[PDB]
Design an enzyme around this catalytic site. Structure first.
Site: not given
Length: 330
Positions: A35, A199
């Site tokens: 994770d 992004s």
């Protein structure tokens, strides 16, 4: 040193991925959910409340000659999905794919929430976010990656998740055969303890690319792709009959649909998520309403590039002095 381990979807939807991990001496092999959105290595164990164990493999520290109680240390964690677990701590030898760390903090669960009990395939979590998020008190502990780092050939690990198929986590090296083209690296902020990046925009299907900065985290421990409501609305508007259902808890779409792809930007590069990756199947067994793999992050407080996004790429988690993230197509 290096390590290389195969990671395998837990079910037909890729709800999560498990990777075998060797703990203790002799080795006890547990299947852990790696994770990159948390920083605790915790396991079901001989100490876990019996009624909260349902099929998981447990770590028994009393059977390990290298286990030592980390005296006084406790841990307690809550995840974004509302699940939680807590317990005490041992140090022991932990190996992943041939890479061994001695003295790793192994957090033994005394209690786990229902979501964990109900998932018989996940024997615990191995956190790969920054160690500043680790919950051990009063002495915060380091992640497996942080402990391994100085011994690694290169201070990196990579996630190569499969779509309905196994993939690979590598430590200490970049497998240049595992991706196509070049890797585009992008800056990381560690201020919140995550692999947080920005992004450069998105496209829906064959639509034009929208240049827009989207801050979010690369999180292998989250199933879906969670993005701003504007972006998600633009996506689902291209699917006839798709809608956001408060009763279901997100966007659903007719199971008869063909989903468009979703592209996200990494610098000037582009990663394309095929439409099929965004299908999470019927909301309930036999339903003709299907659950979407792109959902709004509104009310989470952060955008999350979870498995839906990450499995479309070869992803480099660069833990050099100035950390960065790399994405390549594959």
């Amino acid at each position: 040193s290096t390590g290389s381990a195969t990671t395998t979807p837990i079910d037909s939807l890729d709800d999560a991925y498990i990777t075998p991990v060797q703990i203790g001496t002799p080795a006890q092999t547990l299947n852990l959910d790696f994770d990159t959105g948390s920083s605790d290595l915790w396991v079901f164990s001989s100490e876990t409340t019996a009624s909260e164990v349902d099929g998981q493999t447990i770590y028994t520290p009393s059977k390990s000659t290298t286990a030592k109680l980390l005296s006084g240390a406790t841990w307690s964690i809550s995840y974004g999905d509302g699940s939680s677990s807590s317990g005490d701590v041992y140090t022991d030898t932990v190996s992943v794919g041939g890479l061994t760390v001695t003295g790793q903090a192994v957090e033994s669960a005394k209690k786990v929430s229902s979501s964990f009990t109900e998932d018989s395939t996940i024997d615990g979590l191995l956190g790969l976010a920054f160690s500043t998020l680790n919950t051990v008190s009063p002495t915060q502990q380091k992640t497996f990656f942080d402990n391994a780092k100085a011994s690694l050939d290169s201070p990196v690990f990579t996630a190569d998740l499969g779509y309905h198929a196994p993939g690979t986590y590598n430590f200490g090296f970049i497998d240049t055969t595992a991706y196509t083209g070049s890797i585009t690296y992008t800056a990381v902020s560690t201020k919140q303890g995550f692999w947080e990046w920005t992004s450069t925009g998105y496209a829906v299907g064959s639509g034009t690319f929208k240049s827009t900065s989207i801050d979010g985290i690369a999180d292998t421990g989250t199933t879906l792709l969670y993005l701003p409501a504007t972006v998600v609305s633009a996506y689902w508007a291209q699917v006839s009959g798709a809608k956001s259902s408060s009763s279901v808890g997100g966007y659903v779409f007719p199971c008869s649909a063909t989903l468009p792809s979703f592209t996200f930007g990494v610098g000037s590069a582009r990663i394309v998520i095929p439409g099929d990756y965004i299908d999470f199947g019927p909301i309930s067994t036999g339903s003709s309403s299907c659950f979407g793999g792109i959902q709004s992050s509104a009310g989470i407080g952060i955008n999350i590039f979870g498995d839906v996004a990450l499995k479309a790429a070869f992803v480099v988690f660069n833990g050099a002095t100035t950390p960065t993230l790399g994405f390549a197509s594959k």
